[PDB]
Symmetry: C4
Amino acid sequence: MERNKLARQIIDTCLEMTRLGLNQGTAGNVSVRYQDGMLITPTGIPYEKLTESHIVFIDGNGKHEEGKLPSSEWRFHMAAYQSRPDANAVVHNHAVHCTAVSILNRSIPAIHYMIAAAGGNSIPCAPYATFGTRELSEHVALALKNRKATLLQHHGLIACEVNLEKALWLAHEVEVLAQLYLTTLAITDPVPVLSDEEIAVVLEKF
Amino acid sequence: MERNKLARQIIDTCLEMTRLGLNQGTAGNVSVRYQDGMLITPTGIPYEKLTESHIVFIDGNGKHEEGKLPSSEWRFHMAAYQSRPDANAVVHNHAVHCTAVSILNRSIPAIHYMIAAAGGNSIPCAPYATFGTRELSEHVALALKNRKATLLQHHGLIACEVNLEKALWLAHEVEVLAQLYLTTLAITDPVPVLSDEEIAVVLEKF
Amino acid sequence: MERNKLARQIIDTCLEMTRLGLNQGTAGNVSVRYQDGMLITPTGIPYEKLTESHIVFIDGNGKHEEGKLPSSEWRFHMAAYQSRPDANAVVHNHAVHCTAVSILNRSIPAIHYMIAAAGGNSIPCAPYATFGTRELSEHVALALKNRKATLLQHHGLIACEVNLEKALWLAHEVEVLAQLYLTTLAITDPVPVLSDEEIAVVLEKF
Amino acid sequence: MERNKLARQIIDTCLEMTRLGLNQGTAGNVSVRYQDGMLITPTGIPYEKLTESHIVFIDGNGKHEEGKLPSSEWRFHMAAYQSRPDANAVVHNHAVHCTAVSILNRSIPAIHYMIAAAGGNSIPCAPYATFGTRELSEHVALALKNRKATLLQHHGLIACEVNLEKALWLAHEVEVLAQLYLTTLAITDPVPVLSDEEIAVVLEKF
Ligand SMILES: [Zn+2]
Ligand SMILES: [Zn+2]
Ligand SMILES: [Zn+2]
Ligand SMILES: [Zn+2]
């Protein structure tokens, strides 16, 4: 839990997301719980030009260290850590399939047993609100209360876990589930799902 | 047939599957027939962190060597080698297209002459059962009796052959067939197929 | 603003577009505003065989330096710089998703808040005209008057910005928007959109 | 035109096709016109294990040099060079999109002006016949009479040009056209096309 060791992982995660096809462009942001606040990527700086010195610290009051501009979405990373006290890392990206399902404004159902990875029998979709807005924060906070990941209507995906690699794994897993959903939904509607009872069993085995 | 030479190939195969886009995440497992039992990847350890020392040996009774946890699916690798005595390697993954067709719970038909590569005129889809369950084993064993590969409903794909590279080749081939199926089925239903007589001829030439 | 420093970026951009999957083959062309005219890639020379010496200079009259053949599309790069005086770089490619939407002859609507990146609430589609034609130039010039990017019916995409990297970023962003559009339109028609009022707000925050 | 310089390009082409996503597995074959016959890849040997020594020479009578097994499709490479005397290289692959359109048994229409690259206003689809069959040869020969590329029903794609790189470029271009076709056809049927008159003009400019 050294600011320097955290900064390095944060950039790695951004690089890994681009590497996995879960994000590209100036989209996305990542943070880790640090001290009273968190360490978060800065607004609009390409993952390729990022360095530990660019990572920003925001305290419990929302005070970011001077001369640095935190991610426009810092408020919903805030709400994420408050909604999920068990979570130490938040990952946000505009992954293609997760984003398309969010344009459709649909929760992703129990089409695969791995859905249980997000903590339940669905991946919810949170109502739209202007990006970097406080109202957007209320929407995600509410969605993450009982799920580890949530889609953002007309926006993207946000997943959080105990650490960055488990947070990245989860976000990656949701891109797979979102892709399985879009592919089968184009051929059939509704797409077959496992029953809630079955999901209960799978959650027991997890 | 040296434990060490086998361990190395097993990890390579996992790396190659990720490399080919046939698997990603903590999904998938691979094993080779070894002595009375088999050598199989361990449960939940990233392909990147895998080493020959992590590969687990399970004997004919299902006894895995102490201090090591075999893949949760070890039972259906077992059933695979019992159902197909001609097979020396099993590959399991959650490849995107194979998995979507399995959510649709459909066999993949004779849409391409390469379907004959799995031993017949179809790639079956085995009924769902909780992962790592003995009932799941009964389902795959039954499906592999007359086919070298089978989809797992709401789960993924399992392919086996005489060795790991032929097992990987086959699994890869089925991802192609599953992708040709999903793409044409979105435009037309039913998708045109070669006749069984034609498949018979192709099987003769193989 | 040295001819040599510009030539290098132009080739890089072509390489980066192939690298991002926004273009492949002998398709595409890129130019930068230079002196009274511009520096533009040459017609039909693989990005791999390109060198600073191949980059062509065309003056304000359309006079390209002797012994060099400029891109067949040089006329619409011309029209682009005249239509958008704020723009210093033009990028053209036959990116898969942008091109499919252009075959459908549709503008891309407000399906995502990033649509505002092109300057409005849509990505227009300019009427077809034979490639490398002066009439094609009139069509793009007209489309770029109030937008930074435009699709070309039955052809591809053209995006321009203040410099090559912002021009490449934008073109990349439009491939994402075009892909979100094609994926959701196959499942639903019309695809849900953000209201113009909302887009207005997002444009204010940009 | 040295056997050794040709062998090297042939393998490169196979490697490049896998690299571009136009082929994978043990599928595909490539040949160049050599002396009275041709040099062609051998049947069933992974592109990774190929060497100049594996390339096979078949004479005008179909006599392949001893101890070497030519590609099962050597007969249709033969027919290709006889149908198109202007062609010096043939490329065959089971590229995903070209193959799906061939399962649908459709010609690819004038959806993009680049269709003119294959010599006309369409990419035909040749009737199925067992692979490596003489009747399959009659089908491709007939299709290539007035086109440089043809799809093979329930099989794949075959493209030929004056040399391997122009043959690879063309095959790659057809994968793009086949992908634009499948994507728009899922949303609309029939997919809008340029008129034959327009294609005539484009063919004039080519
Ligand atoms: Zn965002
Ligand atoms: Zn599994
Ligand atoms: Zn163009
Ligand atoms: Zn073939």
